[PDB]
Amino acid sequence: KFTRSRIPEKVFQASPEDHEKYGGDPQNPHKLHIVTRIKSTRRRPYWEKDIIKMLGLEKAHTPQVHKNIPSVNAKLKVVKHLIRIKPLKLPQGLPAEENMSNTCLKSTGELVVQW
Amino acid sequence: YKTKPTHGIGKYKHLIK
Amino acid sequence: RRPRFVSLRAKQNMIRRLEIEAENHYWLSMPYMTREQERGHAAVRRREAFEAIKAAATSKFPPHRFIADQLDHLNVTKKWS
Amino acid sequence: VENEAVAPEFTNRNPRNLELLSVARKERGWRTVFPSREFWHRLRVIRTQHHVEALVEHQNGKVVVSASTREWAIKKHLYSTRNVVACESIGRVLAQRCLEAGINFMVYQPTPWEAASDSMKRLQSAMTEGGVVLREPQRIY
Amino acid sequence: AGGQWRLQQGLAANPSGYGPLTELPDWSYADGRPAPPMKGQLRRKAERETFARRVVLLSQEMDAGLQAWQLRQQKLQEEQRKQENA
Amino acid sequence: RRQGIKKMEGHYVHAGNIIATQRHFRWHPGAHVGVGKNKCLYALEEGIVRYTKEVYVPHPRNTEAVDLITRLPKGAVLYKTFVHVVPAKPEGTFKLVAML
RNA sequence: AGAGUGUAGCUUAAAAGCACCCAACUUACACUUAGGAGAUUCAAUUGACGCUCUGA
RNA sequence: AUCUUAGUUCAACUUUAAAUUUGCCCACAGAACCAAAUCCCCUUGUAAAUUUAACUGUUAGUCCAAAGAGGAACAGCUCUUUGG
Ligand SMILES: [Mg+2]
């Protein structure tokens, strides 16, 4: 029959060849995921429609932020083929109570202040 | 159960010739 | 007829999606916390949010009624003189 | 008077309070394996050809008293260790210790063939007349 | 249509995304005083603001969770020393 | 027919609630778990259900089991599953009734 | 002479656990027992009188 | 279930109004002697779920992927199941 898929953990094991291929690092991982939907929930089982409805990814591309904790990754490992995950980058730090209304997210995934 | 390490603990038929 | 002849454009589209999802694989093999560290850190917010839902659900009731609104309907015969 | 300050919830940290009132829970069930463990203080007699030991132990495996022929204070009054008289003496000592230990109740759960044997019946009768009883009260629900 | 190139140069894929075209004020008065901003700009400022507030809130919660774990490890690893005396 | 578990591990089961309905003895009764004539397992004491693996020592009064254990090599044992209910509440408390 | 050095036949006992013994044991006897017998090998941790073993 | 399969009643699903507080997802643990997965919950992402009052309407559908039983492993074949 057709059933949920339990992905073996072996795939989610970055190698020494993958690390220098994307801008990441084993130690000191990244706080937040910026996730976008690039595929339709239609034509896919209901246990993916519901997940997408839960992560706030209902609309199309429209990026949305989530924690990088396993409780959410378990959800993103089910919808990993209908989304693009990039790591949010903060090369100027979290904004203060000033500069909340003057932020901007660039296509490279960096949140910055005053454009 | 079958998907647990404790599986096959109750076997005894093989203990009879 | 029934069989098809998979083009090159389709292959390139499929490889694009495969690469995107391989990057997704990579960005999920390094979580900030572990199972035990995270446990409970969001409890306060979840409890307060559900309490907000409860307070919204338990506030339904008919709206007030004012004498002014009832007497305003006499304006439907206001005349000059 | 202020000195009458009493907690309206009196506690009793005693580990045998509800036990002796016959209100403590006996662990029921296990209706597919002998021995049953619907008791509080079980007696067990180990009979190995060198020594014989009669022990009384709580439901949780805790030995509350013992009477073993390994004791030098009881080795002397014996030319062997498998005689019925050995069982008599060790059971009498066990009864004395139980009486001096605050345990005047018991359960004995022998095995049908081991129960029919007169050898352990001698010990059973000796300990019974010693002062302890081989049967417990009913729980008071 | 060079969305691939635009994303390869840190720009928005869609020239109507974020850039000088879409967010600078489309007009001013003749004298020089600026114009009441456009609805689209207000809505994008509001949504970016909400995005930033969510970012700071989630990051704060995760850091506070790490600190709480540190505290619990302290008070369970060290309070066992209080049983190592007397 | 529905001969399967009806309260799974880590469930709060009150007195008398059926833990498992079975045909053969798949799950043997344990602490505070009683059996009916139809081999249903029910919770004698209010608490939390757990499942364990233990050693099996059948009644000598029974025959189809007392003999098979007699056909086993040195150092052998029949292990089997059990379902217990760790009780939750204490039996009772003592409260002031009269101050005389 | 002498290298390891030694719990009764056995060992993970600090003076312990196992069958060898015997006896009535419905369709035989082991099972179930009536009952009985075996060591810190010795002088004060160290050395030798015992053993597989070492030149003879 | 029905002198019943050209229909009805009950359930399941749907709708409205109302009350309350947990509902879904979900790791670790756990479910027998004789492969896919399933069940169950702490957290976590969410905002829904249960209960009550009141009605109607639909009901034994087609195709595709998959695992089976019948007809070859075919006859575009009858049927059950997971998904779309
Ligand atoms: Mg759960």
DSSP string, C11-71: HHHHHHHHHHHHHHHHTTS--SS-HHHHTTTTHHHHHHHHHHHHHHHTT--PPP--HHHHH
3-state secondary structure of E53: helix
- What are the tokens at A19? 């690390």
| Euclidean distance between CA atoms F68 and F74, whole angstroms | 13
Nearest Cα of chain F lies from the Cα of D10 at a distance, in angstroms, of 6
Q: Examine residue F29 and say whether the peptide bond preceding it is cis (omega within 30 degrees of 0).
A: no
Q: What share of chain D is helix, strand, coil (3-state, %, to 5)?
A: 35, 15, 50
Place of tokens 């805790």: D62
CB F4, CB F24: distance < 8 Å: no
Place of tokens 């300050």: D5
| Euclidean distance between CA atoms A66 and A31, whole angstroms | 9
Report residue E30 CA to chain centroid gap: 37
Shortest CA distance to A7 belongs to which of A71, A73, A69? Answer: A73
Determine the residue type at A66: H
Output Rg (C-alpha) for chain C, integer angstroms. 32
Count other C-beta atoms under 10 Å from residue F13's C-beta: 23
Place of tokens 């050995």: D86
Å from CA of F3 to ligand 1 middle: 23
| Euclidean distance between CA atoms D57 and D41, whole angstroms | 5
- What are the tokens at E84? 């190592």
| Euclidean distance between CA atoms C11 and C5, whole angstroms | 11
| Euclidean distance between CA atoms D126 and F35, whole angstroms | 36
- What are the tokens at A107? 């296509």
3-state secondary structure of D56: strand
Please name the member of C36, C37, C41 whose beta carbon is closest to the beta carbon of E61. Answer: C41
Shortest CA distance to A41 belongs to which of A2, A78, A8, A91? Answer: A78
- Length of chain D measured in residues: 141
- What are the tokens at A65? 């932020």
DSSP 8-state assignment for residue D68: E
Contact C29 A38 (CB under 8 A): no
H helices, E strands: number in chain A: 3, 5
Please, which chains are in contact with A (at least 3 CB pairs closer than 8 A)? C, E
Q: Among the residues of chain D, which ranges form H helices?
A: 17-20, 72-75, 84-101, 112-116, 118-130
User: In the beta sheet, which residues pair with residue F49?
Assistant: F85
| Euclidean distance between CA atoms F39 and F24, whole angstroms | 8
| Euclidean distance between CA atoms A77 and C21, whole angstroms | 11
Best E16, E55, E57 member to test A by mutation, with max A CBs in 10 Å, is E55
- Torsional sign, CA A64, A68, A70, A76: positive
Count other C-beta atoms under 10 Å from residue D25's C-beta: 19
Q: Checking phi first, is residue D91 left (phi over 0); if not, alpha (psi -120 to 50) or beta?
A: alpha
Report residue E18 CA to chain centroid gap: 15
| Euclidean distance between CA atoms A50 and F38, whole angstroms | 42
User: Which residues 34-63 in chain E show a CB within 8 A of chain A?
Assistant: 45, 48-49, 51-56, 58-59, 61-62
- Looking at beta carbons, which residues of chain A come within 8 Å of E7? 107
- What are the tokens at C13? 């589209």
Place of tokens 């364990």: F52
- Give Cβ neighbours of residue D8 (< 8 Å, ≥ 6 apart): F95, F96
| Euclidean distance between CA atoms B10 and F53, whole angstroms | 9
Helix/strand/coil (H, E, C) string of A30-63?
CCEEEEEECCCCCCCCHHHHHHHHHCCCCCCCCC
Resolution (A): 2.9
- What are the tokens at F23? 């045909």
Å from CA of F10 to ligand 1 middle: 10
Please name the member of D10, D24, D33 whose beta carbon is closest to the beta carbon of F91. Answer: D24
Complete DSSP assignment for F33-60 = EEE-TT--EEESSSEEEEEEEEE----T
Query: Kind and range of the H or E element at D121?
Result: helix D118-130
- Give Cβ neighbours of residue A109 (< 8 Å, ≥ 6 apart): A34, A86, A87, A88, A89
Touch between chain B and chain F: 3 or more Cβ pairs under 8 Å? yes
Shortest CA distance to A68 belongs to which of C20, E70, E61, E67? Answer: E61
Report residue A81 CA to chain centroid gap: 12
Report residue C48 CA to chain centroid gap: 18
**What are the φ/ψ torsions at residue F82 (nearest 5 degrees)?**
-140, 155
Q: How far is CA A64 from CA A31, A59, A69, A100, F1, in A?
A: 14, 10, 15, 17, 48
- Give Cβ neighbours of residue D41 (< 8 Å, ≥ 6 apart): D56, D57, D58, D59, D64, D103, D105, D106, D107, D136
- Give Cβ neighbours of residue A89 (< 8 Å, ≥ 6 apart): A30, A108, A109, A110, A111
Q: How far is CA F28 from CA A58, E7, F42, in A?
A: 49, 65, 11
Shortest CA distance to A110 belongs to which of A84, A86, A88, A85? Answer: A88
| Euclidean distance between CA atoms F93 and F100, whole angstroms | 20
- Looking at beta carbons, which residues of chain E come within 8 Å of C37? 65-66, 69
Report residue F23 CA to chain centroid gap: 16
| Euclidean distance between CA atoms A92 and A115, whole angstroms | 12
- Spell out the domain ranges in chain A: 1-115
CB B17, CB F87: distance < 8 Å: no
Contact F80 B15 (CB under 8 A): no
Nearest Cα of chain C lies from the Cα of E15 at a distance, in angstroms, of 23
Q: How far is CA F72 from CA B9, B17, D71, D87, F66, in A?
A: 15, 10, 36, 32, 11
DSSP 8-state assignment for residue D99: H
| Euclidean distance between CA atoms C73 and E75, whole angstroms | 71
Report residue E76 CA to chain centroid gap: 36
Å from CA of E61 to ligand 1 middle: 23
Strand G-proximal residues of D, range 97-126, CB below 7 A, are 113-114, 117-119
Query: Kind and range of the H or E element at C8?
Result: helix C8-26
| Euclidean distance between CA atoms F34 and A74, whole angstroms | 40
